Amino acid sequence: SDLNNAIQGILDDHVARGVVGVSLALCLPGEETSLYQSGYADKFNKMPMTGDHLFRIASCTKSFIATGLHLLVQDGTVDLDEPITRWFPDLPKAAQMPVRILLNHRSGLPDFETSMPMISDKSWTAQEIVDFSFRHGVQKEPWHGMEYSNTGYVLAGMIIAHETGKPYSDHLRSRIFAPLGMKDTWVGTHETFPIEREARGYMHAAADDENPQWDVSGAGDPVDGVWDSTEWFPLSGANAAGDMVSTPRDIVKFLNALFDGRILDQKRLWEMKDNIKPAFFPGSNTVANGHGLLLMRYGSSELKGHLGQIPGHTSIMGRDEETGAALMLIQNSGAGDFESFYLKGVNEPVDRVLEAIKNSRS
Numbered sequence: 001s002d003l004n005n006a007i008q009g010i011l012d013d014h015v016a017r018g019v020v021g022v023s024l025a026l027c028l029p030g031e032e033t034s035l036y037q038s039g040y041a042d043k044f045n046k047m048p049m050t051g052d053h054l055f056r057i058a059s060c061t062k063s064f065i066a067t068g069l070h071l072l073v074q075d076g077t078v079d080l081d082e083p084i085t086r087w088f089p090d091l092p093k094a095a096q097m098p099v100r101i102l103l104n105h106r107s108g109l110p111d112f113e114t115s116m117p118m119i120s121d122k123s124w125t126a127q128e129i130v131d132f133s134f135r136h137g138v139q140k141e142p143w144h145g146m147e148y149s150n151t152g153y154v155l156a157g158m159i160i161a162h163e164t165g166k167p168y169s170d171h172l173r174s175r176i177f178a179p180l181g182m183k184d185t186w187v188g189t190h191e192t193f194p195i196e197r198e199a200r201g202y203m204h205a206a207a208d209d210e211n212p213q214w215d216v217s218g219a220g221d222p223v224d225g226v227w228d229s230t231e232w233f234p235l236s237g238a239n240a241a242g243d244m245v246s247t248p249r250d251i252v253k254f255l256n257a258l259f260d261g262r263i264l265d266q267k268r269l270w271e272m273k274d275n276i277k278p279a280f281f282p283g284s285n286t287v288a289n290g291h292g293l294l295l296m297r298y299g300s301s302e303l304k305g306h307l308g309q310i311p312g313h314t315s316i317m318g319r320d321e322e323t324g325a326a327l328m329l330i331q332n333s334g335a336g337d338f339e340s341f342y343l344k345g346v347n348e349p350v351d352r353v354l355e356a357i358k359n360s361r362s
């Protein structure tokens, strides 16, 4: 179709901007998921990008951890409004923290991501990340305002583990991945994944990487304007804040089924997507968030989903509610600065695709 050719052109023009490669999955209403890739999975081997190339989905992981949590609310074991002291009695200010503030980025919890070395071979415990957060981060009061929290999702994961007796990966697999047919999806912290199948991740030495968001010391020297950051960071360091590996095809499987009532009941879905407050993420299109989903505005279209940044892989997923379209676009180009073209610029092809969808619908 004309749409098919318009979309492949958007991806081609984006990789021509300097982006190593991009993988997209797009489901439109009354249609099968159609996949589009451009550029390379492996810059130096010139391997073409396919729809079978795995990516680290980074904070997109967060939409699954919320779902898993919401599933345990349906199970009757967890209450969104009850204090987390039940699970974390010694956590400062815990009594002011209902289960929902873990998910909604209003908890005031101190964060770990900006202090955590991105290059290491160190494995992390959930608790180890939490002690790290309080040691290096800044704690604000609950409900102070919106400030993106990874720590809240790490704590969310620990609730899941305690309530189900097994690692949070077991719950997400048995309740989400398995019944949906998601066969190319792993939870990094607790599961091994086929490294050989992953698209390589590229950090660009770019002029606009003026204010790196990560401690990337130990990177060594670049080669042909990039570092291969694929295996820089152990996923156990991100934990429930961003440890999942997947394909855009598998993610669209999840999204269609979530927005289609087939995972979460109508009340848990409403919490996730409709019970919202204003939200900010530096260099993104985020305007609001629920309890697991960021609302990201692209001109006259909006996606409910998530952004993901982990060194070298850069992802945007969501559903457009006005049009029914689901999409996961991931590039294997990244940088550190939020405002870098290599991070913030992933939003441009996403915008253009939603414009092409809209125009083909008129």
Ligand SMILES: *C(=O)[C@H](N)Cc1ccccc1
Pocket: 057, 058, 059, 060, 113, 116, 150, 237, 238, 241, 242, 307, 308, 309, 310
């Ligand atoms: C979301 O994309 C967060 N940046 C994921 C993350 C990555 C590293 C360490 C903690 C959280």
Ligand SMILES: [Ba+2]
Pocket: 210, 211, 212
């Ligand atoms: Ba600087």
Ligand SMILES: [Ba+2]
Pocket: 119, 120, 121, 231, 232, 233, 234
């Ligand atoms: Ba390493």
Ligand SMILES: [Ba+2]
Pocket: 300, 301, 322
């Ligand atoms: Ba509109």
Ligand SMILES: [Ba+2]
Pocket: none
């Ligand atoms: Ba409107």
Ligand SMILES: [Ba+2]
Pocket: 359, 360, 361, 362
């Ligand atoms: Ba038209």
